[PDB]
């Protein structure tokens, strides 16, 4: 009944205000907020989304996330993007690749509320794609000069790995990911190092010691300890088979 209706795909595109896009172009942040408010409510009221042309909506949200000077709007746009990606599940796959790079770069913003929304967004989007498909953006981001981006990128990999099938990573990808993460692991920044250790430990948890160990032969003893600690705490939420 009620609960079953939650499984009923809703056409939210036809329910948005006729001035949704125009308001997002207003200079007054409170007007931009009005469009996002309405959208956020539509997304929370209808967890199951009908198929449709979401390109314009995704582009509008990305614009707010990457260019809005108001962090409250950035967080709201991030949240909406996360709910949109969740409501479409795999139906979001076609928009994923363009979103990933933008979200990762936005991790230069450190306000915790924005960070939480960005994590939710990139995590929901990951579910519709794969590390194989997003490797270039991910690896490129681990090279970002901004410590905050490097750290959040490594943490993104850690969370992603807990929901990844072991068969989703071939030898090449495993080596590329490990090599890139060992590089940030040896960075002078403490947070970046911890985040890299968490990602590496999760990677071992998922792929197994024998498979990954060889690639960490040159990691010093102290760092290996951090990695193993994280490995112990990592929880792989998926089922191989």
PDB file of C-alpha atoms in Angstrom:
ATOM      1  CA  UNK A   1       0.000   0.000   0.000  1.00  0.00           C
ATOM      2  CA  UNK A   2       1.664   3.175   1.251  1.00  0.00           C
ATOM      3  CA  UNK A   3       5.101   1.536   1.346  1.00  0.00           C
ATOM      4  CA  UNK A   4       4.563  -0.038  -2.065  1.00  0.00           C
ATOM      5  CA  UNK A   5       3.812   3.398  -3.494  1.00  0.00           C
ATOM      6  CA  UNK A   6       7.382   4.360  -2.594  1.00  0.00           C
ATOM      7  CA  UNK A   7       8.336   1.950  -5.383  1.00  0.00           C
ATOM      8  CA  UNK A   8       6.170   3.876  -7.837  1.00  0.00           C
ATOM      9  CA  UNK A   9       8.311   5.983 -10.244  1.00  0.00           C
ATOM     10  CA  UNK A  10       7.306   9.641 -10.014  1.00  0.00           C
ATOM     11  CA  UNK A  11       7.624  12.245 -12.770  1.00  0.00           C
ATOM     12  CA  UNK A  12       9.209  15.069 -10.778  1.00  0.00           C
ATOM     13  CA  UNK A  13      10.393  16.839 -13.922  1.00  0.00           C
ATOM     14  CA  UNK A  14       6.800  17.815 -14.699  1.00  0.00           C
ATOM     15  CA  UNK A  15       6.259  18.897 -11.092  1.00  0.00           C
ATOM     16  CA  UNK A  16       8.989  21.505 -10.865  1.00  0.00           C
ATOM     17  CA  UNK A  17       8.061  25.193 -10.820  1.00  0.00           C
ATOM     18  CA  UNK A  18       7.861  26.848 -14.228  1.00  0.00           C
ATOM     19  CA  UNK A  19      10.497  29.325 -13.027  1.00  0.00           C
ATOM     20  CA  UNK A  20      12.875  26.769 -11.522  1.00  0.00           C
ATOM     21  CA  UNK A  21      15.695  27.533 -13.965  1.00  0.00           C
ATOM     22  CA  UNK A  22      15.121  31.288 -14.244  1.00  0.00           C
ATOM     23  CA  UNK A  23      15.300  31.743 -10.470  1.00  0.00           C
ATOM     24  CA  UNK A  24      18.599  29.839 -10.306  1.00  0.00           C
ATOM     25  CA  UNK A  25      20.004  32.637 -12.480  1.00  0.00           C
ATOM     26  CA  UNK A  26      18.956  35.391 -10.045  1.00  0.00           C
ATOM     27  CA  UNK A  27      21.630  37.413  -8.256  1.00  0.00           C
ATOM     28  CA  UNK A  28      19.787  37.338  -4.934  1.00  0.00           C
ATOM     29  CA  UNK A  29      20.742  34.088  -3.197  1.00  0.00           C
ATOM     30  CA  UNK A  30      17.326  33.804  -1.525  1.00  0.00           C
ATOM     31  CA  UNK A  31      15.730  33.486  -4.952  1.00  0.00           C
ATOM     32  CA  UNK A  32      18.157  30.757  -6.000  1.00  0.00           C
ATOM     33  CA  UNK A  33      17.401  29.080  -2.649  1.00  0.00           C
ATOM     34  CA  UNK A  34      13.696  28.990  -3.518  1.00  0.00           C
ATOM     35  CA  UNK A  35      14.256  26.764  -6.574  1.00  0.00           C
ATOM     36  CA  UNK A  36      16.521  24.355  -4.677  1.00  0.00           C
ATOM     37  CA  UNK A  37      14.090  24.227  -1.712  1.00  0.00           C
ATOM     38  CA  UNK A  38      11.223  23.110  -3.905  1.00  0.00           C
ATOM     39  CA  UNK A  39      13.423  20.571  -5.679  1.00  0.00           C
ATOM     40  CA  UNK A  40      14.829  19.156  -2.458  1.00  0.00           C
ATOM     41  CA  UNK A  41      11.273  18.602  -1.214  1.00  0.00           C
ATOM     42  CA  UNK A  42      10.202  16.898  -4.444  1.00  0.00           C
ATOM     43  CA  UNK A  43      13.219  14.585  -4.204  1.00  0.00           C
ATOM     44  CA  UNK A  44      12.547  13.704  -0.566  1.00  0.00           C
ATOM     45  CA  UNK A  45       8.828  13.127  -1.205  1.00  0.00           C
ATOM     46  CA  UNK A  46       9.456  10.813  -4.177  1.00  0.00           C
ATOM     47  CA  UNK A  47      12.396   8.412  -3.576  1.00  0.00           C
ATOM     48  CA  UNK A  48      11.652   6.566  -6.830  1.00  0.00           C
ATOM     49  CA  UNK A  49      12.150   8.627  -9.981  1.00  0.00           C
ATOM     50  CA  UNK A  50      10.680   8.035 -13.424  1.00  0.00           C
ATOM     51  CA  UNK A  51      12.916   7.881 -16.509  1.00  0.00           C
ATOM     52  CA  UNK A  52      13.397  11.206 -18.267  1.00  0.00           C
ATOM     53  CA  UNK A  53      15.722  13.910 -19.582  1.00  0.00           C
ATOM     54  CA  UNK A  54      17.591  14.983 -16.438  1.00  0.00           C
ATOM     55  CA  UNK A  55      20.509  16.535 -18.289  1.00  0.00           C
ATOM     56  CA  UNK A  56      19.321  20.128 -17.800  1.00  0.00           C
ATOM     57  CA  UNK A  57      18.714  19.557 -14.098  1.00  0.00           C
ATOM     58  CA  UNK A  58      22.118  17.939 -13.534  1.00  0.00           C
ATOM     59  CA  UNK A  59      23.830  20.797 -15.375  1.00  0.00           C
ATOM     60  CA  UNK A  60      21.945  23.372 -13.269  1.00  0.00           C
ATOM     61  CA  UNK A  61      22.956  21.639 -10.038  1.00  0.00           C
ATOM     62  CA  UNK A  62      26.581  21.313 -11.157  1.00  0.00           C
ATOM     63  CA  UNK A  63      26.659  25.026 -11.958  1.00  0.00           C
ATOM     64  CA  UNK A  64      25.509  25.893  -8.436  1.00  0.00           C
ATOM     65  CA  UNK A  65      27.959  23.448  -6.874  1.00  0.00           C
ATOM     66  CA  UNK A  66      30.963  24.652  -8.841  1.00  0.00           C
ATOM     67  CA  UNK A  67      30.219  28.368  -9.294  1.00  0.00           C
ATOM     68  CA  UNK A  68      27.908  29.612  -6.521  1.00  0.00           C
ATOM     69  CA  UNK A  69      29.650  31.880  -4.009  1.00  0.00           C
ATOM     70  CA  UNK A  70      27.062  31.007  -1.357  1.00  0.00           C
ATOM     71  CA  UNK A  71      28.059  27.852   0.563  1.00  0.00           C
ATOM     72  CA  UNK A  72      24.496  27.277   1.750  1.00  0.00           C
ATOM     73  CA  UNK A  73      23.419  26.967  -1.899  1.00  0.00           C
ATOM     74  CA  UNK A  74      26.398  24.733  -2.706  1.00  0.00           C
ATOM     75  CA  UNK A  75      25.381  22.334   0.095  1.00  0.00           C
ATOM     76  CA  UNK A  76      21.728  22.335  -0.981  1.00  0.00           C
ATOM     77  CA  UNK A  77      22.708  21.676  -4.603  1.00  0.00           C
ATOM     78  CA  UNK A  78      25.009  18.869  -3.480  1.00  0.00           C
ATOM     79  CA  UNK A  79      22.222  17.303  -1.426  1.00  0.00           C
ATOM     80  CA  UNK A  80      19.761  17.549  -4.324  1.00  0.00           C
ATOM     81  CA  UNK A  81      22.303  15.936  -6.664  1.00  0.00           C
ATOM     82  CA  UNK A  82      22.770  13.080  -4.189  1.00  0.00           C
ATOM     83  CA  UNK A  83      19.019  12.470  -3.909  1.00  0.00           C
ATOM     84  CA  UNK A  84      18.660  12.666  -7.680  1.00  0.00           C
ATOM     85  CA  UNK A  85      21.433  10.101  -8.195  1.00  0.00           C
ATOM     86  CA  UNK A  86      19.850   7.833  -5.560  1.00  0.00           C
ATOM     87  CA  UNK A  87      16.355   8.105  -7.011  1.00  0.00           C
ATOM     88  CA  UNK A  88      17.587   7.158 -10.474  1.00  0.00           C
ATOM     89  CA  UNK A  89      20.084   4.509  -9.345  1.00  0.00           C
ATOM     90  CA  UNK A  90      21.665   3.022 -12.491  1.00  0.00           C
ATOM     91  CA  UNK A  91      19.497   5.340 -14.603  1.00  0.00           C
ATOM     92  CA  UNK A  92      21.971   8.059 -13.554  1.00  0.00           C
ATOM     93  CA  UNK A  93      24.952   6.389 -15.261  1.00  0.00           C
ATOM     94  CA  UNK A  94      24.929   8.676 -18.304  1.00  0.00           C
ATOM     95  CA  UNK A  95      25.413  11.807 -16.163  1.00  0.00           C
ATOM     96  CA  UNK A  96      28.044  10.332 -13.814  1.00  0.00           C
ATOM     97  CA  UNK A  97      31.297  10.991 -15.705  1.00  0.00           C
ATOM     98  CA  UNK A  98      30.708  14.738 -16.055  1.00  0.00           C
ATOM     99  CA  UNK A  99      29.769  15.056 -12.366  1.00  0.00           C
ATOM    100  CA  UNK A 100      32.711  13.233 -10.751  1.00  0.00           C
ATOM    101  CA  UNK A 101      35.531  15.653 -11.727  1.00  0.00           C
ATOM    102  CA  UNK A 102      33.488  18.715 -10.680  1.00  0.00           C
ATOM    103  CA  UNK A 103      32.558  17.249  -7.311  1.00  0.00           C
ATOM    104  CA  UNK A 104      36.136  16.174  -6.501  1.00  0.00           C
ATOM    105  CA  UNK A 105      37.561  19.612  -7.308  1.00  0.00           C
ATOM    106  CA  UNK A 106      34.948  21.232  -5.093  1.00  0.00           C
ATOM    107  CA  UNK A 107      36.516  19.456  -2.116  1.00  0.00           C
ATOM    108  CA  UNK A 108      38.787  22.507  -1.941  1.00  0.00           C
ATOM    109  CA  UNK A 109      35.897  23.910   0.106  1.00  0.00           C
ATOM    110  CA  UNK A 110      36.370  22.878   3.740  1.00  0.00           C
ATOM    111  CA  UNK A 111      33.126  23.991   5.372  1.00  0.00           C
ATOM    112  CA  UNK A 112      31.935  20.684   6.930  1.00  0.00           C
ATOM    113  CA  UNK A 113      28.325  21.084   5.789  1.00  0.00           C
ATOM    114  CA  UNK A 114      29.431  21.390   2.172  1.00  0.00           C
ATOM    115  CA  UNK A 115      31.851  18.478   2.586  1.00  0.00           C
ATOM    116  CA  UNK A 116      29.070  16.229   3.899  1.00  0.00           C
ATOM    117  CA  UNK A 117      26.789  17.122   0.968  1.00  0.00           C
ATOM    118  CA  UNK A 118      29.604  16.629  -1.564  1.00  0.00           C
ATOM    119  CA  UNK A 119      30.446  13.207  -0.111  1.00  0.00           C
ATOM    120  CA  UNK A 120      26.794  12.161  -0.261  1.00  0.00           C
ATOM    121  CA  UNK A 121      26.579  13.327  -3.859  1.00  0.00           C
ATOM    122  CA  UNK A 122      29.727  11.676  -5.164  1.00  0.00           C
ATOM    123  CA  UNK A 123      28.924   8.484  -3.231  1.00  0.00           C
ATOM    124  CA  UNK A 124      25.399   8.222  -4.674  1.00  0.00           C
ATOM    125  CA  UNK A 125      26.803   8.917  -8.131  1.00  0.00           C
ATOM    126  CA  UNK A 126      29.483   6.239  -7.746  1.00  0.00           C
ATOM    127  CA  UNK A 127      26.736   3.637  -7.326  1.00  0.00           C
ATOM    128  CA  UNK A 128      25.707   4.299 -10.941  1.00  0.00           C
ATOM    129  CA  UNK A 129      29.203   3.923 -12.369  1.00  0.00           C
ATOM    130  CA  UNK A 130      32.554   2.281 -11.474  1.00  0.00           C
ATOM    131  CA  UNK A 131      36.186   2.942 -10.569  1.00  0.00           C
ATOM    132  CA  UNK A 132      37.183   1.562 -13.971  1.00  0.00           C
ATOM    133  CA  UNK A 133      35.004   4.178 -15.686  1.00  0.00           C
ATOM    134  CA  UNK A 134      36.128   7.028 -13.409  1.00  0.00           C
ATOM    135  CA  UNK A 135      39.813   6.136 -12.960  1.00  0.00           C
ATOM    136  CA  UNK A 136      41.229   9.064 -14.942  1.00  0.00           C
ATOM    137  CA  UNK A 137      39.289  11.677 -12.967  1.00  0.00           C
ATOM    138  CA  UNK A 138      40.039   9.944  -9.667  1.00  0.00           C
ATOM    139  CA  UNK A 139      43.768   9.562 -10.319  1.00  0.00           C
ATOM    140  CA  UNK A 140      44.024  13.101 -11.677  1.00  0.00           C
ATOM    141  CA  UNK A 141      42.336  14.380  -8.515  1.00  0.00           C
ATOM    142  CA  UNK A 142      44.856  12.596  -6.266  1.00  0.00           C
ATOM    143  CA  UNK A 143      47.388  14.893  -7.948  1.00  0.00           C
ATOM    144  CA  UNK A 144      45.400  18.064  -7.208  1.00  0.00           C
ATOM    145  CA  UNK A 145      47.698  20.558  -5.466  1.00  0.00           C
ATOM    146  CA  UNK A 146      45.056  21.167  -2.804  1.00  0.00           C
ATOM    147  CA  UNK A 147      45.566  18.942   0.296  1.00  0.00           C
ATOM    148  CA  UNK A 148      41.828  18.937   1.018  1.00  0.00           C
ATOM    149  CA  UNK A 149      41.057  17.553  -2.438  1.00  0.00           C
ATOM    150  CA  UNK A 150      43.731  14.849  -2.155  1.00  0.00           C
ATOM    151  CA  UNK A 151      42.386  13.753   1.215  1.00  0.00           C
ATOM    152  CA  UNK A 152      38.705  13.709   0.237  1.00  0.00           C
ATOM    153  CA  UNK A 153      39.583  11.934  -3.001  1.00  0.00           C
ATOM    154  CA  UNK A 154      41.360   9.194  -1.029  1.00  0.00           C
ATOM    155  CA  UNK A 155      38.440   8.964   1.400  1.00  0.00           C
ATOM    156  CA  UNK A 156      36.045   8.770  -1.558  1.00  0.00           C
ATOM    157  CA  UNK A 157      38.034   5.768  -2.827  1.00  0.00           C
ATOM    158  CA  UNK A 158      37.850   4.136   0.618  1.00  0.00           C
ATOM    159  CA  UNK A 159      34.069   4.484   0.875  1.00  0.00           C
ATOM    160  CA  UNK A 160      33.681   3.424  -2.769  1.00  0.00           C
ATOM    161  CA  UNK A 161      35.749   0.260  -2.246  1.00  0.00           C
ATOM    162  CA  UNK A 162      33.455  -0.917   0.563  1.00  0.00           C
ATOM    163  CA  UNK A 163      30.742  -1.158  -2.107  1.00  0.00           C
ATOM    164  CA  UNK A 164      32.770  -2.571  -4.973  1.00  0.00           C
ATOM    165  CA  UNK A 165      32.898  -6.085  -6.416  1.00  0.00           C
ATOM    166  CA  UNK A 166      36.419  -7.556  -6.320  1.00  0.00           C
ATOM    167  CA  UNK A 167      35.978  -8.505  -9.985  1.00  0.00           C
ATOM    168  CA  UNK A 168      35.546  -4.806 -10.817  1.00  0.00           C
ATOM    169  CA  UNK A 169      39.310  -4.288 -10.490  1.00  0.00           C
ATOM    170  CA  UNK A 170      41.789  -5.829 -12.919  1.00  0.00           C
ATOM    171  CA  UNK A 171      45.560  -5.902 -12.416  1.00  0.00           C
ATOM    172  CA  UNK A 172      46.162  -2.601 -14.222  1.00  0.00           C
ATOM    173  CA  UNK A 173      43.569  -0.650 -12.216  1.00  0.00           C
ATOM    174  CA  UNK A 174      44.772  -2.175  -8.948  1.00  0.00           C
ATOM    175  CA  UNK A 175      48.348  -1.123  -9.701  1.00  0.00           C
ATOM    176  CA  UNK A 176      47.321   2.365 -10.851  1.00  0.00           C
ATOM    177  CA  UNK A 177      45.193   2.958  -7.762  1.00  0.00           C
ATOM    178  CA  UNK A 178      47.795   1.599  -5.335  1.00  0.00           C
ATOM    179  CA  UNK A 179      50.640   3.539  -6.972  1.00  0.00           C
ATOM    180  CA  UNK A 180      48.642   6.774  -6.856  1.00  0.00           C
ATOM    181  CA  UNK A 181      47.588   6.273  -3.234  1.00  0.00           C
ATOM    182  CA  UNK A 182      51.097   5.328  -2.059  1.00  0.00           C
ATOM    183  CA  UNK A 183      52.210   8.626  -3.558  1.00  0.00           C
ATOM    184  CA  UNK A 184      49.747  10.644  -1.469  1.00  0.00           C
ATOM    185  CA  UNK A 185      50.502   8.353   1.481  1.00  0.00           C
ATOM    186  CA  UNK A 186      54.041   9.726   1.407  1.00  0.00           C
ATOM    187  CA  UNK A 187      52.796  13.319   1.213  1.00  0.00           C
ATOM    188  CA  UNK A 188      53.879  15.593   4.098  1.00  0.00           C
ATOM    189  CA  UNK A 189      50.275  16.421   5.001  1.00  0.00           C
ATOM    190  CA  UNK A 190      49.033  14.312   7.980  1.00  0.00           C
ATOM    191  CA  UNK A 191      45.385  14.216   6.879  1.00  0.00           C
ATOM    192  CA  UNK A 192      46.209  13.274   3.288  1.00  0.00           C
ATOM    193  CA  UNK A 193      48.426  10.499   4.652  1.00  0.00           C
ATOM    194  CA  UNK A 194      45.714   9.181   6.985  1.00  0.00           C
ATOM    195  CA  UNK A 195      43.124   9.274   4.200  1.00  0.00           C
ATOM    196  CA  UNK A 196      45.489   7.444   1.854  1.00  0.00           C
ATOM    197  CA  UNK A 197      46.144   4.812   4.526  1.00  0.00           C
ATOM    198  CA  UNK A 198      42.395   4.315   4.973  1.00  0.00           C
ATOM    199  CA  UNK A 199      41.909   3.807   1.236  1.00  0.00           C
ATOM    200  CA  UNK A 200      44.860   1.414   1.023  1.00  0.00           C
ATOM    201  CA  UNK A 201      43.658  -0.601   4.004  1.00  0.00           C
ATOM    202  CA  UNK A 202      40.180  -0.875   2.534  1.00  0.00           C
ATOM    203  CA  UNK A 203      41.719  -1.966  -0.762  1.00  0.00           C
ATOM    204  CA  UNK A 204      43.535  -4.821   1.003  1.00  0.00           C
ATOM    205  CA  UNK A 205      40.342  -5.741   2.861  1.00  0.00           C
ATOM    206  CA  UNK A 206      38.587  -6.124  -0.500  1.00  0.00           C
ATOM    207  CA  UNK A 207      41.276  -7.620  -2.740  1.00  0.00           C
ATOM    208  CA  UNK A 208      43.254  -9.628  -0.191  1.00  0.00           C
ATOM    209  CA  UNK A 209      46.759  -9.338   1.269  1.00  0.00           C
ATOM    210  CA  UNK A 210      48.425 -11.569  -1.327  1.00  0.00           C
ATOM    211  CA  UNK A 211      47.133  -9.515  -4.232  1.00  0.00           C
ATOM    212  CA  UNK A 212      47.984  -6.058  -2.861  1.00  0.00           C
ATOM    213  CA  UNK A 213      51.008  -6.701  -0.610  1.00  0.00           C
ATOM    214  CA  UNK A 214      53.502  -6.954  -3.491  1.00  0.00           C
ATOM    215  CA  UNK A 215      52.578  -3.405  -4.499  1.00  0.00           C
ATOM    216  CA  UNK A 216      53.380  -2.090  -0.999  1.00  0.00           C
ATOM    217  CA  UNK A 217      56.835  -3.659  -0.714  1.00  0.00           C
ATOM    218  CA  UNK A 218      58.464  -0.217  -0.473  1.00  0.00           C
ATOM    219  CA  UNK A 219      56.059   1.344   2.037  1.00  0.00           C
ATOM    220  CA  UNK A 220      57.878   1.973   5.312  1.00  0.00           C
ATOM    221  CA  UNK A 221      56.918   0.092   8.542  1.00  0.00           C
ATOM    222  CA  UNK A 222      55.132   3.009  10.239  1.00  0.00           C
ATOM    223  CA  UNK A 223      52.872   3.612   7.251  1.00  0.00           C
ATOM    224  CA  UNK A 224      52.184  -0.120   6.846  1.00  0.00           C
ATOM    225  CA  UNK A 225      50.958  -0.107  10.451  1.00  0.00           C
ATOM    226  CA  UNK A 226      48.483   2.703   9.720  1.00  0.00           C
ATOM    227  CA  UNK A 227      47.286   0.809   6.660  1.00  0.00           C
ATOM    228  CA  UNK A 228      46.805  -2.433   8.605  1.00  0.00           C
ATOM    229  CA  UNK A 229      44.893  -0.608  11.337  1.00  0.00           C
ATOM    230  CA  UNK A 230      42.528   0.782   8.716  1.00  0.00           C
ATOM    231  CA  UNK A 231      42.395  -2.624   7.035  1.00  0.00           C
ATOM    232  CA  UNK A 232      41.106  -4.114  10.288  1.00  0.00           C
ATOM    233  CA  UNK A 233      38.338  -1.545  10.665  1.00  0.00           C
ATOM    234  CA  UNK A 234      37.288  -1.544   7.007  1.00  0.00           C
ATOM    235  CA  UNK A 235      33.916  -3.204   6.360  1.00  0.00           C
ATOM    236  CA  UNK A 236      33.230  -4.557   2.871  1.00  0.00           C
ATOM    237  CA  UNK A 237      29.485  -4.099   2.490  1.00  0.00           C
ATOM    238  CA  UNK A 238      29.197  -6.108  -0.730  1.00  0.00           C
ATOM    239  CA  UNK A 239      28.922  -9.788  -1.668  1.00  0.00           C
ATOM    240  CA  UNK A 240      31.491 -11.218  -4.080  1.00  0.00           C
ATOM    241  CA  UNK A 241      30.013 -14.363  -5.672  1.00  0.00           C
TER     242      UNK A 241
END
